Structures are given as structure tokens and as C-alpha cells.
Design a protein around this nucleic acid. Sequence first.
DNA 1: GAGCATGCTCA
DNA 2: TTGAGCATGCTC
DNA 3: GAGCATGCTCA
DNA 4: TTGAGCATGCTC
Lengths: 194, 194, 194, 194
Amino acid sequence: SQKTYQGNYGFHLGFLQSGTAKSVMCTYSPPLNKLFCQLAKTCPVQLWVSATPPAGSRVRAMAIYKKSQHMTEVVRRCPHHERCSDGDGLAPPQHLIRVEGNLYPEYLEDRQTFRHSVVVPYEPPEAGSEYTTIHYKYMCNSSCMGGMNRRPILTIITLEDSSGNLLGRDSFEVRVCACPGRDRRTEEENFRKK
Amino acid sequence: KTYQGNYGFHLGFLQSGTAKSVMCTYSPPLNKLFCQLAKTCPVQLWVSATPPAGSRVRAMAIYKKSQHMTEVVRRCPHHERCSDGDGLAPPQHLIRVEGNLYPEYLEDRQTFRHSVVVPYEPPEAGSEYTTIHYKYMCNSSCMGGMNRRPILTIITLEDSSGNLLGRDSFEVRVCACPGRDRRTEEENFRKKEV
Amino acid sequence: SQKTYQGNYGFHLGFLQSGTAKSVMCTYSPPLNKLFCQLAKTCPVQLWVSATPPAGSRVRAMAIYKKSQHMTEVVRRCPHHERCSDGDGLAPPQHLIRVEGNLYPEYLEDRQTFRHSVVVPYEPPEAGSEYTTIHYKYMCNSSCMGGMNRRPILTIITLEDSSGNLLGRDSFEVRVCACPGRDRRTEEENFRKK
Amino acid sequence: KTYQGNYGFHLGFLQSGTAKSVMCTYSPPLNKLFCQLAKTCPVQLWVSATPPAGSRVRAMAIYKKSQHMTEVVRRCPHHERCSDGDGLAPPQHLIRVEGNLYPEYLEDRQTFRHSVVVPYEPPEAGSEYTTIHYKYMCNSSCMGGMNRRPILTIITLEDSSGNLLGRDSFEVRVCACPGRDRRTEEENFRKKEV
DNA sequence: GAGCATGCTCA
DNA sequence: TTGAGCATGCTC
DNA sequence: GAGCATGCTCA
DNA sequence: TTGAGCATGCTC
Ligand SMILES: [Zn+2]
Ligand SMILES: [Zn+2]
Ligand SMILES: [Zn+2]
Ligand SMILES: [Zn+2]
């Protein structure tokens, strides 16, 4: 979760460099290791490895509340959006994180913790690339009443083999909001105190 | 829609300068009540003559703008599912009457609009009006509900058979800070009055 | 159509006076007898009569292209909007004009000319009012490709008795567009040449 | 997605300064073709070695932005129903090949994407490239279709079995005035180049 | 709402 | 047949 | 994007 | 319990 290890494959995440039109809907903050994005907008997250993972490897994405006081609560879409008609025909209505660009994502709910997660097969970079890109979408604002309700979350991306064993793990905070650029500057300026 | 009828029926609101004003404050220039969610709002019933025996008072909410007037005013998805019920009011109803052991919560079979009805009671000896306490269970801003759309509360005096005897109305804004918001709307309004 | 007669009841239309927030979505131009409005926005049209119409009277609204070269073509929604999911559960998908605020409008298609029209019962003004208001909605922009395709239209409002006989008739041009205020000024300034 | 393969495959476009430029003009700095609706666009196929016998060339359109990349690119509701068919191309297809009596119009059974395939033909004696003429049947602005969303045309060289031999691509903007629009996008682009 | 984005009209 | 200028929805 | 619109945090 | 100021989606 909060702990990130590269494992035997040197796994870790990367984010889009600044200076692109995508920045308006999705912008990453290095000093805060936090992604600021708008609701239902595709966010390109990069997967970096120093060695090819075993055949059949998978990449899972899960959201957990950052504050230890809310860590046990399952992150889910608020009552309103869970009922909106925005389903892609693949993602369940209550899931916050969706993968865009994949015909066969696996949307899971842990039988014990009841946490939602989405899994897609691991794919190596395109020829001439040092990373693989997976586009994610967050279907609720961090402010949504009855949902995240202004509570910040962390997205945990874990590399696992075909059997479900962890091969690597990385994470980043996320704020789904109306104005990513504005809100990112705010938190960064506020951060400039130490 | 505002007629006093044969009984001089019209509404009244408590004058300013009371601790209650913080949670509920009426604006004469805008004929608009500003109140907090779930807080009791005292509305006064005034008549020039005693209504026929068995008369009733109905409260109903409708969106003020013709653009949304046909949409039934109801609580948003989140609050409907909160456990704030009083054991009398249906979960979807926005307006609840406080202090009455026997209110009637109705849904019109044709328009599907919600309304609450209580018996008409004469003023207490020494008073010139009757007070009914209402509570609004969603903010005007609630996503998936009123969603920032202003509403009007329509109070009608009816005989035992359901015939209208009189009708009055006022705009309502349920919000976190009634005082602040009332001033804001009044100042804007006054920005044309001088 | 183009000819307007008040009949034995002095029937004629009236429009909302300027200086209201509604003006942004719906604004009438007197010198051009033209209504500029946005798509799917409620337009309050006033019905004026000097005498009470016979019991069972009806008010019909129909759209016809203004140019004699297109007069024979039936005005309908373009291919795209006819398939959008904006139906109110009462109006057929191809109809341009819809009535808002009525539970029982009659949406018709002339068996011979195939022209669409919507009919609602005539209702007298509210007490203290000199006119009756009917809210209409136009479901396509005048510019819609494959629909009105930049061709201006006329809305014909006719008062008819219970049997379908004409009692009165009035009309006005309409431009459904993105910016009513902007476009109204444009045509008015252009009109200022004579 | 751009690799020349073992046959040095890549695309070429006619140089500027031809009457054709008015209906079809390529922009080197933006690797973007600007063309009018239904106008033939000559695309050049270049290879350094003769492809295996039975090779084919496929053309497919995809939305450039990851936000819309999964949505199948197709003609809008209006043009699909226009009677501009050539008796070969399905009504919903955006890209049509001109000058070939036997093109194959396909729809992938899984992604449902449209594509058109024609046999690979060697350059005419004396030429260093092969020309294929394509037509785009909707403007990039068509409502209910591309709806102002930029697209990419992907041309792939494949052997007789369907295996990719090479692949290249270019952005496309179908519009009313290619020259004007090309300059506009280039000037903006140049507003960072100096 | 402004300004940008874009098909259509006019000579 | 071709822009130039007018006409018009969309971005923020 | 700016500025307005509004619930929540803090003392 | 109450604003003041901060936090944030929506209007145009
Ligand atoms: Zn939500
Ligand atoms: Zn609510
Ligand atoms: Zn249309
Ligand atoms: Zn089209």
C-alpha cells in the first residue's frame, strides 16, 4: 500500500511529462507524488521494468484512503454516480477505477476485504519504448458526498505473476477534481512550507 | 398562484433578531427563506376568518424555473439513503413537518409530486397566527437532487374535501450558511434597486 | 401560416418582456417578430384573447419553413437528434416542437401533408392575468445538418374549437441557436437597413 | 506504431503546388493531411524491397486522443443515410478507396472497427512509389460522428496471411477549407517553434 | 460571454 | 472553381 | 480559465 | 454554536 518495492524486476511507475494538452484534464505533481485529474478523463500511467516479467504477468490497480483513520473503508463511487448511466458495459457501477483501451479487463471485489480492483494483462513496451502505458479513469470526484467525501486516496499499482504473487508495487496519491491545474498549484504552494 | 381566498389566508415569517435566525432567516425583498439542512423552520399561517371545520394545510416543493418545473422535487441519492428518518416521513421526501404526531405524506398519483398535509389548527389564544414547523432534508446544492436549482414551497389551505381555500408561496434555499447567502442574494438584488 | 387573423375572439400572441435571466436562453425580437432561443430550452409564449373561447377549445403549434422554396418540406428534427435519448416519454423523436408543463399534450402528424403539430387544451389566464402561458421547446438548432439546415422557420399558433375549426391564428419566426442574444443583435443590426 | 519493417515501408504525399492541393494538402510539420469531404486523396506507398506475393494494404481510422481511442470511427447519422454510396462501400464507413473495382470493406469481429483493404501493387515502371486514392466521407466536425475529434489514419502493409509487414500513419482533418485550416494549425504550431 | 472554430454564401 | 467574409457551435 | 458559488475546517 | 477563510464544482 504505502510501501513501494521494485522487486526483482525493478518495477516502478512513471507519469506523463508536463507541457501537453492532456495536462488540463490530467497533471502529475512530482514533489507530492500526486495525480490531479478530472472525472471520467483518461490518465496515462507508465509501467517501468528493468527486466521482462514472467509470462502471464498481470497489473492490478486499487484505491485505498490515505488517512489511517479511513484506511479500512472501501473506496467506492458515491450514491449518485453509482446510478448514473455512464457504464462502459464492462466496469461495475460501484467501481471508482476503470481501465480504458482494454477489451478484457477483470473487475474484482475481494471476497474478504471487499475492496475493488481492476486487473489487465502485463504487456511489454512497444518497440523503441522503455515503458508500457495503461490509461485509467476515476469515476468520482474526491469531493463526492457519500463517496470519497473530500478524503484523499492512493492508487496502488501492483505487478503480479500468473498465480497472483506480488512481483512489484508502486503508488501515488490522487485528487479527482474539476480544475486539476488550479488544485495542483494550491497544494504545491501549501506544500512549500518546510 | 397566490390568492388569500375567502379566509384572508397568507403566510408570515418570524421577524429578524432571534438566535433562530442563524439556522433560518427570511428575506422580505426576495420572498425567500434561507435555512440549513434538517433545521426546523417556523412558518406562520394567517387568516381573517375561521376556516371550515376539518380544514388542512399542505406543503409542496416545485422548481421555480419553467425549465425544471415538471421535474418532481426530491432528495438526492445520498440523503435518501441516510438513516435520518423520523419513522413517519418517507425517505425520498424533501419537506418534513416537525412536532406533529400525525402528518400525512403524499405522492400524487398523476404528477408524482410529494407533499405533506397536517390539520389546520387555530392560533393559540392571544396569537393572530398559527405556526407550523417544516424541515428541508437536502441542501439546494445537493448533486443528483435539487442540484443548485432554486425551489418554491407552496402552502395551500384546503377544506376537508381537498378544495383549495387559499394559497401562498415562498422561494427556499437550503444551505450551509443562510445569513451569508441571504446577504449575497440581497446585495445582488439591491444592485438595481437604488 | 403567414396570414394572421385575430378572429371573433381577438386572438394574438405575446412574448416575455426583456430584462430577465430567461433572456439568455430565450429572447424575442419585436421589429423582426422573431424568437431567438437555445435548443431544448423552455420558451414562454403568451396567448391573448378579448373574449372567452368556446368550451373545449384547443391551441395547436406547428412549424413551417419561411422560404416559399422550402414551404412544402416538412420541418423535422435532423437525423442525429432524432436518435438522441432526450425524449420526455410523450413527444415522438422526430418532432421539433414539444410542449413543457403538460401531462397530456397531443402530438400529431397530418395524414395528408405529414406535418407535425402539438395540441394542448386552451386554458384561460390565471386570476388577475390578461394572458395564458404555454412553454414550448425546439429540439434542433436552425443550423442542424440534414434538418432545418440553416433554413429559418415560422411557428404557427392556431386557436381552434372542439371540432377543429380555426378561431384565430398568429405566428412568429424562430431561430434556434447557441447564442440567442448575439444572433438577435446580428439580425437586428442587419435589419437596420431600410 | 510506426515501423518500416523488412521492406522499408512508409508513406509519402504529393508535394505542394498542384491544383489538387485545394482539395487535399499535406502538412509535413504536423504529419497531418487536410482534405475536403468525398475528395480523392492520393497517398503514396514506399518500400525498399518487393513485398511477398499476395501482400495487401489496409486503411483504418482511429481517434487520436486516448479519451476517445476505443470509440469506433464512423460516419455521422446524416451522411450515413445520404445516397452517396458507390455500390461497394458500406454506408457507415468513413474511408473509401477510389479507383479499385475490388476493395474489401471490413468490420473487425472484436473491436468492430472499419477498414478497407486492397491488393498491394508495385510502383508503375519508372516510379519509386505506389499511389492509392482514399476518400473520407464526413467532415471532422460532423455532429454525432467524429464531432470535431481529430483522427489518425493507419496504413499497414500485410502479407497474404494478414501478418503485418509495415505500418505508418498520419493525422487527418476533413474540412471545408483545407488550405485555410492547414495554415491556422501550422501557425499555432509555429507559435513555439521559433 | 469571448474568442476560437468552421461550414456556407457571394462575386 | 476559389478564397474572403459571414455565419455559428464549442471551449473554458 | 475566471469568478462566482458553497459546503467544511478552525479557533 | 458561529462566522472567516479555505476548499471546489459550475457558469459562460
Ligand atoms: Zn461521485
Ligand atoms: Zn441531499
Ligand atoms: Zn438537430
Ligand atoms: Zn458526416
